[model samples]
Target: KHDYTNPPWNAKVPVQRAMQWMPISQKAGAAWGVDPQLITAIIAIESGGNPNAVAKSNAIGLMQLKASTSGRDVYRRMGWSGEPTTSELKNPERNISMGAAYLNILETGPLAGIEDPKVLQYALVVSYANGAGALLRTFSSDRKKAISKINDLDADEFLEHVARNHPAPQAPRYIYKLEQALDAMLEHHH
Candidate 1:
């Protein structure tokens, strides 16, 4: 079990890695209305700023975006004709762009019903790791019930709940890592 009272917030490696991509992250955030620090945190967690990083799950680049799902959705949003090519996904600019766009899609679409922006951000982090469907389904079989359940809790409570209930073992830790990276980045002005 995670120590809820003293979750590690002394993260540094991912913060440093994320700082290297701050310019690109800022651009993507501007384009998609995402918090640059959030993108930074995600890049920190996803690939530690390694543009060439490739996961066994086929996620690639700085943001570790899979060319099929996330890449395709971003392309569709951009009015592009097809999924992003491997080379496109590998480029830092396009990778961050697509990753941020996908997050925006979650915010404006499936997660639009979330009443709180802070709560929404937490949901986004977990959903990014475990998928919105799984995150919502964990709250309740019905989407409205899930939204209401999420709305009832504050951000801190939501984190504890996700840590305990999310199916993916990594879901809780993933959100925690993102928060740690985000706090470090914001405090250090990286």
Candidate 2:
């Protein structure tokens, strides 16, 4: 059996450190009325709280900014002067900042048609895991139906679906574990 009592999947890092640059994430979340826990979940899922971890697919550092189309779009939108080189994505702070900004864009920009925050969040998750094309197809086919299906889904359900349906690897349970940590952090700080 898994030990559920020990700091949420043995997340060895302090919650404070896990949320070191959370101000940026919080601002981004607020713009879209999103729970910052969602941002924390994504970061935790992608990097396991290791800001410096890189993926074999060349997804650099935290949030796993892939060296592909989505990554390029994010970099360009952030006004990053040049292309996102491997070195740039490897930088922890830069990666998190960019990732947060990109999420903000997804919530408030092209995905803005989604009215409910939760539905927008669900679509954003799909877009993040797959790509804009997939999300656009789904959104075009049956926007209300898709949103209605996932409206009440929580973060864990979202992650589970992503794990099962998407190509990305399954994030450990600690990804959802940060939701509680973030809730506590918000209560104290906000």
Candidate 3:
């Protein structure tokens, strides 16, 4: 029942707690070429800066990372020598850093060089909130070479392709919520 309108989301916005983890998320974003606000917005809306928040889906910590999909894949892609446990993911900084790293891959990967900000955020949220396979699967085993050309497609076009091809019914709301948080954070809605 989120109306999808609110600069501050709610008045008691756990601002101090978010501030404490801001540097952690910021440091991770700085290393990864992501906008820190983008990471913060996800953290704010997902967990309200609470390191202990777990979703109905068991998405954990400040970033609300699930065990499968984005979380495990991120560990593997980042070359973790061992499997990451739920306890490790529960730690706030690790969660933020891992989320930032995943974003870096999306920003620098097959869909790199996208110019449209809205499209970029939409795709990023879809991949993060859903999974990279949503976008990656748009290419085919037959069109293996096409994967390299994702950057050639316009962001909106690629997004359309994902929507038409993948049909992520849940992604739009995820995008809107994060975007609202970003709007509020960037505008300093204090």
Candidate 4:
């Protein structure tokens, strides 16, 4: 289902890699209000299921969150003293906890009041890549309540709607990749 052969940073991760973090991903994910399936979707793409993956940009662990800023913010939110360093976050559970925490903030922020599971799921997922500010921009102004009705649209309508409102070149494909990855992960599980 998920073609690692799929482009845009294809890592050909094994199926085992997707669920390897399930227990902790489920724990932190539930506490942070993220779906464990969604967690696998992100970790699959972000780190090719490699918990130790570190971007040259300092994004660390399975979720590839920036250690100094976003990771530390999660620590601060959890009432921990001192910023969390990259090496400390190499512990996948801590990394996932922080990643879920950061994603939780975005889920409550820009993606707030959203109802549709399909729509909300994709929005929260992309916030990891697109940032909260950009997400806010994507839904500003008169259509605030109107944004919640995505399920009403057919597939083509939904795609066009998202394309016009939030698609910026790779954004649409990026979202699709995450959706497909989740689909693949869930398919294997179910």
Candidate 5:
């Protein structure tokens, strides 16, 4: 059992950092149809507002995108043919742009058909950290069955389901931190 109303947020972010990223986040969110607070939440944990941060997984910049995967996905979405260079990924605007765009891909693509926005955002956070296929497989092997299973639950239930079932141990913590950041972003009016 967990407190859906106020989940633990041990990995908190600075309000100042969240404010700094808001304008760019809003711009990126507008283009991709994603919520700016969600993007802000991502930035908070992904890099703590450090555009140069790189993960050992080979993910680059603020959104922690791998140049070969998300980098290529967003580039192709823009009608470009190849992945962005390190410098491009490091640029704040470009980084958020690609991050928001990739979230859009998850929203409208593999994670589609779910009716609730909150549940979808929860799924997006999980899928962004893990893989969409991994998230779906937690529900069922079949694509349609997976979506149906997801649709059957409320956002809180979905959160519990992923927290326990996702293969990655960090997946639940990722959601908690992201939710914490989102709350801060909204509360701070950024």
Candidate 6:
């Protein structure tokens, strides 16, 4: 489970690796109106920044995209014609590109014209972790509450609240694990 007691700057190695991909993440985030830090956080939680980690469910590469169907959709959309092998995901550039592109598509497709970017972002994350259909069904129930809490918060506060309130019953632990890495990179860049 993720520990929120510590500040974001104290994140671990996995978090650091995710943070290192911010340049790629930031560009993707801009297209979808997502905070770059949130993208980095998601990557850390999904794959711990290991470009070659494949989940039991066949989720390949850094973002752990399931090779069954979701992976195929993304791969096809990106115009990749090669075999859907795990080796393709080991390429960081390819992984980030596919990950960011998928994220952008989800934000624009299911989350179009949502007004508040944060709401769209939260919805997208839920959809990514859960499923688009499930998120759509319960979107109204918790959207207002989530928006109110996330409205003025920074990326850290936003991620923290989402983790606390969303409550994915079967999902992995995913909070505060990438803040240190992200903050360190941002500080270094600035």
| Candidate maximizing lDDT | 1
**1-190 in candidate 5: lDDT tens per residue?**
3333354554345545756888999998998898988888888777888889899567888888888988899888789999988899899999999999999999988998999888998899889988899999988999889999999999888889987788875666677777777667666753
Clashes of each: 0, 0, 0, 0, 0, 1
Of the two candidates 4 and 5, the one with more favorable TM-score, higher being better, is 5
Per-residue lDDT of model 1, residues 34-87, tens digit only: 988888888888888899989747899988888888888888888988898889
Off by over 4 Å in 4: 1-15, 141-159, 165-168
Off by over 4 Å in 2: 1-17, 27-35, 78-81, 142-190
Q: lDDT per model, in order? A: 0.84, 0.59, 0.68, 0.69, 0.83, 0.61
Q: State TM-scores per candidate.
A: 0.91, 0.61, 0.71, 0.79, 0.90, 0.65
lDDT for model 1 comes to 0.84
Kindly list the per-residue Cα lDDT of model 6 for residues 58-134, writing each as its tens digit: 78887777655666776677687643567767777667666776777776665555566655555566677776555
User: How many clashing residue pairs, candidate 3?
Assistant: 0
Error of 5 at 23 (Å): 0.5
Compute the lDDT for candidate 3.
Answer: 0.68
Candidate 5, superposed: residue stretches over 4 Å from native: 1-12
Candidate 1: residue 86 Cα off by (Å): 1.1
Better of 3 and 6 by TM-score: 3
Task: Tell me how candidate 6 scores on lDDT.
Answer: 0.61
Q: Candidate 2 — which pairs collide?
A: none
Model 2 is weakest, by summed lDDT over 10 consecutive residues, at 167-176
Clashes of 1: 0
Please state the error at residue 73 of candidate 4 in Å. Answer: 2.7
